[PDB]
Structure formats: structure tokens, C-alpha cells
Amino acid sequence: MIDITLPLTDIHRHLDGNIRAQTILDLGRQFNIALPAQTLETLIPHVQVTSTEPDLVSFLTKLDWGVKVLASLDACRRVAFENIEDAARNGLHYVELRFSPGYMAMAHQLPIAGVVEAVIDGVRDGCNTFGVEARLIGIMSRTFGEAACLQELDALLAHRENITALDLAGDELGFPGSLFLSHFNRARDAGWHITVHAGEAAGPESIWQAIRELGAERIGHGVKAVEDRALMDFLAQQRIGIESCLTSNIQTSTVASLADHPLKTFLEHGVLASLNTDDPAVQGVDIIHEYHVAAPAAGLSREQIRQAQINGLEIAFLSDSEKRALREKVA
Ligand SMILES: OC[C@H]1O[C@@H](n2cnc3c2N=CNC[C@H]3O)C[C@@H]1O
Ligand SMILES: [Ca+2]
Ligand SMILES: [Ca+2]
Ligand SMILES: [Zn+2]
């Protein structure tokens, strides 16, 4: 169940992996961009996983059409606004929206810092309209190499007072986290919080690298952490959050079945693991499905599902006052 007396969060949620299919059609028409399909029914298999993808890199290609229609900064503002609307429609009280401004800007060569500003604007408008609380996480898309990631870093730094955290996402095996030592040194000097996609396609060594070298306070996925008990202990003792995305892990073939997902194991070891969506539009599911379908299939008890719900706020990049206000309201 979702406990309606506790805040509902989603802290691993890619804005640019959540571009509505109707919005892809609308923007393609507005900009006269040729699309692979002309109706929702025929567009879906090009923009959404229909069963599973064979690996992480294949899954990543499903986001491409959404960002290929972003031909202006106003289009970026629209998708940011619609992302807050989607969060509101799912009963979320608090979201952290992560986005790769370089990935969003790539197709039409938009100014990368302008994409950051447009996302900030659209999220501000959406929060004002719907009342969802939100913070922004900038992503460096490792897939495009260290120099492209520096361009994204510079764009986010030009808006650093509006960005709460930095993340590394994309092709984990092709671009190990060790390559981004300098990018994260600069992020920590800027005072940003740190999360890192790690231990999804690669092993526990990638998680250790994210913690010890990149300064990660949370780990995106971290599925392979169960292979190292010392790592499990370190996560629990140091209160390093785990951002679990059950359906995503099925759809990237990171786990073959939810019955073998490590989320239950994390919670039994005292790790602050939370339930999240990842890429709602691409996956065809949102947070309600993760709680009511994916989490029971992953073997979690009712109490464990509640603990994951609590952990999402506990690991949020929010002040004690902000966390208290959300808890006091919903109680
Ligand atoms: O926000 C868009 C960026 O994030 C990547 N990205 C989007 N969803 C995921 C990503 N990366 C790694 N693991 C799978 C899943 O969690 C794609 C793009 O670079
Ligand atoms: Ca509110
Ligand atoms: Ca009280
Ligand atoms: Zn992700």
C-alpha cells in the first residue's frame, strides 16, 4: 500500500525520460519534424518499452525521440511543466527531477545553459500551479564522453543556485565513473549534493568508485551492491541512499525477474533504499504501479514497502525543516 499519512516521493525520475507521447506528436507537428509514427498507437513502440530491452544501452535509445522534438527552449519549458503536472497526477508530494541539458539540447543544438534555465522556469511554473514540491538534479550523460559532460557541467554551474545535485547517467560500462573525477571535484566544490548511477550494468566496484571518488551521497540502482557485504555495511552505516527502480531494472535486463531483485535484501540490511520510477513515459508505468505491482512482485512485505516510502524522504536532498514540513502536512 501507499501510506497516505506519510509523504510520497520519487527521487530518481528523469524529466527527459518522461516526455509524454502526445507531446512528442504535438511538438513534431509544431516544428515539422518527421516522426517514425503519426498516431499515439503507432508511436508507442518507438518511445516506450513494450516488454524488455536486452541491455542498458538498448533501453537508453528509447528516450531519443522525446528529445529529438525539443527544437526550442519553450519546448523544454513545456516538458518541464508537464513533468510537474505528471508528478501531481500521481499523488507525489515531493519529486527530484533529473535531466541532462546536453542530451535535451543535442538534437537541435539549443544553448545548453538555456535548456537549464528553461527547465528551471517550467518546474517553477508547475510547482506554483500544482503545489508539488520539487528540486532539480543536473545529469552529465556519460555516453557522450568527458568533454561533452564538461559542457553540461558548465551550463549547470551557470545556474548553480537553482540546482540541488549532480548525477552521472547513461552508458555505465562504456564510460566508467573513474573518468569523471574532475567533474565531481567541481560539483562538490560548488556545494551540490551527489548521486551517481552505479552498479546497474557494472559491478560493485563501480559503486565503491562512486562513493569513494565521486563523493556520492546516494547511488542510482546499486543493484550489484549485494555482491559485497562490506559494501552493504558501508551503505547502511554511512546512510548512503539507494535509489531503487524496479520496473526499470526489468526493462534494462539488469535483473531477469523481480523475484530476484535486491531491494528486499537492502531493507533487511538497514540500507536506506527507496522506491522510484526512473523514466515513466519510456517504461509505461509511474509510481503507483511501482508500489502496487512491482514492489509486491519483488517480494516486499507491507512493512517493507512502508519503510521504502519513508526512506525516500529520508534520503531526499532537503533540509530537516523541509522534510519536517512535508511530514507534518501529510500526517
Ligand atoms: O536524463 C537523461 C539521461 O539519463 C540517462 N538515463 C535515463 N534513464 C536511465 C539513464 N541512465 C542510466 N541507467 C538507466 C536509467 O536509470 C539517459 C540520458 O543520458
Ligand atoms: Ca506542496
Ligand atoms: Ca507534529
Ligand atoms: Zn536513471
XYZ file of C-alpha atoms and ligand atoms in Angstrom:
353
model
C 0.000 0.000 0.000
C 0.929 3.680 -0.211
C 0.577 5.221 3.260
C -1.443 8.433 2.880
C -0.217 9.678 6.282
C 3.397 9.780 5.031
C 4.778 11.911 2.192
C 5.075 10.178 -1.177
C 8.319 10.938 -3.013
C 10.105 9.978 -6.208
C 13.773 10.967 -6.148
C 15.053 9.086 -9.245
C 12.897 10.450 -12.038
C 14.306 11.657 -15.377
C 12.412 14.660 -16.730
C 13.867 13.974 -20.184
C 12.862 10.312 -19.977
C 9.297 11.415 -19.235
C 8.169 13.274 -22.349
C 4.526 12.352 -22.972
C 3.790 10.575 -26.237
C 1.091 13.120 -27.101
C 3.629 15.897 -26.529
C 6.041 14.199 -28.942
C 3.278 14.199 -31.575
C 2.358 17.813 -30.774
C 5.911 19.147 -30.926
C 6.773 17.124 -34.025
C 3.765 18.678 -35.748
C 4.514 22.179 -34.436
C 8.134 22.061 -35.659
C 7.529 19.952 -38.817
C 9.909 17.277 -37.521
C 9.417 13.923 -39.218
C 8.423 11.266 -36.681
C 8.508 7.456 -37.010
C 4.727 7.325 -36.487
C 1.767 9.678 -36.760
C -0.627 8.399 -34.057
C -0.271 7.505 -30.398
C -0.876 3.822 -31.126
C 1.909 3.568 -33.697
C 4.293 5.935 -31.863
C 4.250 3.958 -28.596
C 6.690 1.155 -29.611
C 9.224 3.790 -30.719
C 9.073 5.801 -27.472
C 8.214 3.137 -24.891
C 9.472 -0.284 -23.858
C 6.860 -2.850 -24.834
C 8.358 -5.771 -22.895
C 12.087 -5.608 -22.107
C 15.228 -4.316 -23.760
C 18.238 -6.661 -23.863
C 20.671 -4.306 -22.112
C 21.118 -0.814 -20.715
C 22.324 0.804 -23.952
C 19.307 -0.534 -25.874
C 16.967 0.899 -23.231
C 18.673 4.305 -23.489
C 17.753 4.574 -27.184
C 14.063 4.659 -26.225
C 14.479 8.226 -24.884
C 15.794 9.560 -28.206
C 12.534 10.548 -29.919
C 11.321 12.578 -26.951
C 14.403 14.778 -27.008
C 14.520 14.904 -30.816
C 11.421 17.175 -30.837
C 12.933 19.754 -28.451
C 13.537 22.422 -31.086
C 13.242 25.464 -28.803
C 13.728 26.455 -25.187
C 9.969 26.967 -24.927
C 9.554 23.284 -25.820
C 11.897 22.455 -22.924
C 9.829 24.662 -20.598
C 6.672 22.821 -21.685
C 8.098 19.371 -20.954
C 9.412 20.553 -17.570
C 5.960 21.935 -16.692
C 4.266 18.729 -17.876
C 6.632 16.743 -15.680
C 5.373 18.545 -12.563
C 1.812 18.003 -13.776
C 2.557 14.266 -14.136
C 4.018 14.173 -10.624
C 0.869 15.848 -9.293
C -1.314 13.342 -11.171
C 0.484 10.524 -9.341
C -0.071 11.870 -5.833
C 3.571 12.807 -5.276
C 4.180 15.413 -2.599
C 7.864 15.805 -3.453
C 9.938 14.964 -6.505
C 13.532 15.366 -7.547
C 13.597 15.782 -11.314
C 16.875 14.893 -13.001
C 17.728 15.985 -16.532
C 20.673 16.042 -18.947
C 20.680 19.514 -20.557
C 23.250 18.442 -23.139
C 21.120 15.440 -24.121
C 17.999 17.621 -24.332
C 19.830 20.243 -26.392
C 21.667 17.786 -28.686
C 19.180 17.267 -31.489
C 18.577 20.944 -32.247
C 21.781 22.466 -30.832
C 19.952 24.527 -28.242
C 22.079 26.631 -25.865
C 22.872 24.205 -23.055
C 22.642 26.793 -20.286
C 19.396 27.972 -21.865
C 17.976 24.463 -21.526
C 18.889 24.583 -17.829
C 17.111 27.938 -17.469
C 14.077 26.651 -19.370
C 13.805 23.579 -17.134
C 14.052 25.796 -14.036
C 11.303 28.048 -15.444
C 8.954 25.195 -16.322
C 9.445 23.490 -12.975
C 8.849 26.783 -11.140
C 5.608 27.342 -13.044
C 4.490 23.754 -12.480
C 5.183 23.858 -8.747
C 3.264 27.147 -8.496
C 0.336 25.653 -10.438
C 0.101 22.195 -8.841
C 1.725 22.573 -5.414
C 4.153 19.663 -5.779
C 7.467 20.390 -4.086
C 10.475 19.806 -6.312
C 14.242 20.030 -6.564
C 16.418 19.722 -9.657
C 19.308 17.328 -10.298
C 21.552 18.003 -13.284
C 22.829 14.965 -15.196
C 26.028 14.526 -17.130
C 25.336 11.990 -19.882
C 28.484 9.836 -19.709
C 27.577 8.277 -23.080
C 28.831 11.346 -24.952
C 32.279 11.467 -23.353
C 34.071 13.554 -20.750
C 34.286 16.729 -22.858
C 30.552 16.785 -23.638
C 29.940 16.229 -19.929
C 32.108 19.242 -19.080
C 29.896 21.356 -21.361
C 26.852 20.199 -19.392
C 28.688 20.864 -16.134
C 29.489 24.433 -17.222
C 25.842 25.019 -18.184
C 24.590 23.762 -14.813
C 27.208 25.789 -12.919
C 25.867 28.954 -14.572
C 22.607 28.145 -12.736
C 24.181 26.531 -9.698
C 21.931 28.196 -7.072
C 18.893 26.518 -8.655
C 20.486 23.057 -8.995
C 20.456 20.847 -5.906
C 22.585 17.883 -7.035
C 24.683 16.445 -9.864
C 24.280 12.928 -11.306
C 26.079 10.746 -13.853
C 23.863 8.696 -16.161
C 23.858 6.841 -19.469
C 26.191 4.053 -20.678
C 27.841 2.817 -17.459
C 30.034 0.056 -18.940
C 31.333 2.191 -21.786
C 32.213 5.195 -19.606
C 33.265 4.207 -16.073
C 32.736 6.631 -13.236
C 36.504 6.906 -12.708
C 36.655 9.037 -15.860
C 34.603 11.804 -14.201
C 36.809 12.504 -11.175
C 37.354 16.130 -12.200
C 33.681 16.794 -12.972
C 32.647 15.649 -9.500
C 35.507 17.502 -7.793
C 33.993 20.669 -9.266
C 30.459 19.639 -8.300
C 31.448 19.129 -4.665
C 33.327 22.439 -4.612
C 30.091 24.078 -5.843
C 28.276 22.652 -2.811
C 25.996 20.343 -4.771
C 24.756 17.047 -3.426
C 25.969 13.993 -5.334
C 24.185 10.966 -6.726
C 25.605 8.542 -9.308
C 24.047 5.811 -11.443
C 26.298 2.889 -10.495
C 26.151 -0.866 -10.093
C 23.445 -1.284 -12.720
C 25.320 -2.615 -15.734
C 28.664 -2.795 -13.890
C 29.583 -4.465 -10.623
C 30.163 -3.433 -7.010
C 33.485 -1.810 -7.904
C 31.553 0.891 -9.749
C 29.524 1.574 -6.599
C 32.674 1.790 -4.458
C 34.187 4.201 -7.007
C 31.077 6.405 -6.922
C 31.183 6.549 -3.126
C 34.918 6.930 -2.583
C 35.963 9.058 -5.586
C 32.847 10.905 -6.717
C 31.592 11.603 -3.195
C 28.165 10.063 -3.780
C 25.568 10.546 -1.058
C 23.122 8.265 -2.902
C 23.529 5.615 -5.581
C 21.214 5.214 -8.546
C 20.271 1.500 -8.699
C 23.264 -0.003 -6.898
C 21.794 -3.420 -7.753
C 25.178 -5.152 -7.626
C 25.886 -3.953 -4.071
C 24.511 -7.236 -2.740
C 27.625 -8.938 -4.131
C 29.804 -7.279 -1.443
C 28.737 -7.458 2.216
C 31.325 -4.869 3.232
C 29.711 -2.503 0.732
C 26.243 -3.258 2.125
C 27.544 -2.435 5.599
C 29.140 0.794 4.395
C 25.899 1.900 2.733
C 23.925 1.237 5.908
C 26.462 2.717 8.346
C 27.155 5.850 6.275
C 23.469 6.327 5.382
C 24.181 6.339 1.648
C 20.794 6.134 -0.045
C 19.887 3.545 -2.668
C 17.515 4.703 -5.403
C 15.693 1.526 -6.478
C 13.773 1.442 -9.793
C 12.147 -1.987 -10.018
C 10.444 -1.882 -13.435
C 13.415 -0.050 -14.961
C 15.729 -2.871 -13.844
C 13.442 -5.430 -15.520
C 13.288 -3.372 -18.704
C 17.084 -2.911 -18.988
C 17.641 -6.633 -18.270
C 19.586 -5.601 -15.160
C 17.526 -8.222 -13.295
C 15.755 -11.075 -15.057
C 12.787 -11.193 -12.680
C 11.525 -9.078 -9.809
C 11.552 -12.117 -7.509
C 15.361 -11.836 -7.551
C 15.550 -8.073 -7.092
C 17.834 -6.996 -4.213
C 15.501 -4.292 -2.807
C 14.181 -6.588 -0.053
C 17.769 -7.538 0.813
C 18.775 -3.864 1.076
C 15.930 -3.162 3.501
C 16.734 -6.227 5.617
C 20.318 -4.921 5.961
C 19.158 -1.478 7.084
C 20.098 0.252 3.841
C 18.072 3.391 3.096
C 16.637 2.087 -0.177
C 13.662 3.894 -1.738
C 11.121 3.187 -4.493
C 11.350 5.318 -7.643
C 10.192 5.369 -11.271
C 13.278 6.218 -13.418
C 11.711 7.029 -16.842
C 7.890 6.939 -16.566
C 6.953 7.679 -20.188
C 9.566 5.280 -21.567
C 8.588 2.485 -19.174
C 4.825 2.946 -19.431
C 4.477 2.956 -15.629
C 4.555 5.543 -12.858
C 4.983 5.466 -9.084
C 1.569 3.955 -8.311
C 2.442 0.906 -10.405
C 5.792 0.585 -8.638
C 4.061 0.411 -5.246
C 1.121 -1.813 -6.212
C 2.587 -4.158 -8.835
C 6.387 -4.093 -8.873
C 7.114 -3.945 -5.131
C 4.885 -6.926 -4.167
C 6.336 -8.881 -7.096
C 9.786 -8.111 -5.677
C 8.769 -9.945 -2.506
C 8.449 -6.951 -0.183
C 6.136 -7.150 2.810
C 3.680 -4.367 3.592
C 6.034 -3.081 6.291
C 8.987 -3.104 3.881
C 7.004 -1.104 1.302
C 6.200 1.450 4.008
C 9.874 1.578 5.006
C 10.852 2.264 1.392
C 8.280 5.071 1.316
C 9.800 6.592 4.465
C 13.341 6.186 3.124
C 12.570 8.238 0.013
C 12.032 11.345 2.114
C 14.861 10.456 4.498
C 17.388 10.418 1.631
C 15.902 13.408 -0.225
C 18.264 16.346 -0.762
C 16.158 18.533 1.538
C 16.792 20.363 4.789
C 15.473 18.986 8.055
C 12.894 21.797 8.059
C 11.640 20.916 4.565
C 11.342 17.216 5.434
C 9.529 18.087 8.668
C 7.031 20.310 6.841
C 6.110 17.540 4.401
C 5.686 15.022 7.232
C 3.622 17.406 9.363
C 1.280 18.210 6.472
C 0.555 14.622 5.404
C 0.245 13.200 8.949
O 18.215 12.021 -18.173
C 18.613 11.523 -19.455
C 19.980 10.859 -19.321
O 19.944 9.837 -18.307
C 20.220 8.568 -18.898
N 19.278 7.629 -18.286
C 17.937 7.733 -18.292
N 17.389 6.699 -17.593
C 18.363 5.864 -17.137
C 19.583 6.527 -17.611
N 20.889 6.139 -17.403
C 21.297 5.050 -16.872
N 20.599 3.989 -16.442
C 19.249 3.632 -16.842
C 18.199 4.615 -16.361
O 18.319 4.831 -14.934
C 19.962 8.736 -20.390
C 20.401 10.168 -20.608
O 21.836 10.169 -20.681
Ca 3.160 21.467 -1.539
Ca 3.801 17.209 14.949
Zn 18.048 6.733 -14.021
